[PDB]
Write a protein that binds this ligand. Structure first.
Ligand SMILES: CCCCCCCCCc1cc(O)cc(O)c1C(=O)O
Ligand SMILES: CCCCCCCCCc1cc(O)cc(O)c1C(=O)O
Lengths: 104, 104
């Protein structure tokens, strides 16, 4: 179509002791970044329900739509993104980061 | 619309010896499954461009929409899916699978 987009995909595992209340606060603050970082055009997330890689332990997936890899860079270095890591890095055990253009 | 569908997300790293042409043939013959497996509605895929995961170097991402976890499981055991997985399993080094309903 006429618009171009790049998807920023994050896969996440929280540390075992993190509470559901803490996860909720974490996620609310993350999705709120759309009100702070204009590069972020869409945010959708979900929790895995099938546990096909239970041993690896990733549970959460977030998809963020951007116009280009250049605006993704603006999001990465935005002070609110750095600050989110400052406050919440201690909540996650591991992450996977991907940037790609979905195609058929 | 109000529908509550489920996304099937696959993240993959091929073995180092697999050629680009072989990866493309794998993807092409994976997308052909939409024509064979009733549950498989659509497929989008992409190649990661930012390479941020260090020792966990997944390269390819595929997203498939399904009605439900049950119809995902239909796709898993369908003989054309079993056959695809059987004969290409030696292609990949790392594989993660997630099933989730995207939400805001
Ligand atoms: C519904 C779950 C919300 C998960 C939010 C995860 C935020 C991760 C922040 C981050 C940390 C990092 O060390 C490297 C990065 O690339 C990134 C990023 O892409 O945002
Ligand atoms: C653009 C790259 C295309 C990737 C195709 C990956 C095929 C994976 C087949 C499989 C094997 C398995 O052991 C378990 C599973 O759930 C599955 C699956 O979900 O399809």
């Amino acid at each position: 179509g006429p618009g171009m987009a790049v998807k920023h995909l994050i896969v996440l595992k929280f540390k075992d002791e993190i509470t559901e209340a803490q996860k909720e606060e974490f996620i609310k603050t993350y999705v709120n970044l759309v009100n702070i970082i204009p590069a972020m055009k869409d945010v959708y997330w979900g929790k895995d329900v099938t546990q096909k890689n239970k041993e690896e332990g990733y549970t959460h997936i977030v998809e963020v739509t951007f116009e280009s890899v250049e605006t993704i860079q603006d999001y990465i270095i935005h002070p609110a993104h750095v600050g989110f890591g400052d406050v919440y890095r201690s909540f996650w055990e591991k992450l996977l980061i991907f940037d790609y253009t979905p195609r058929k």
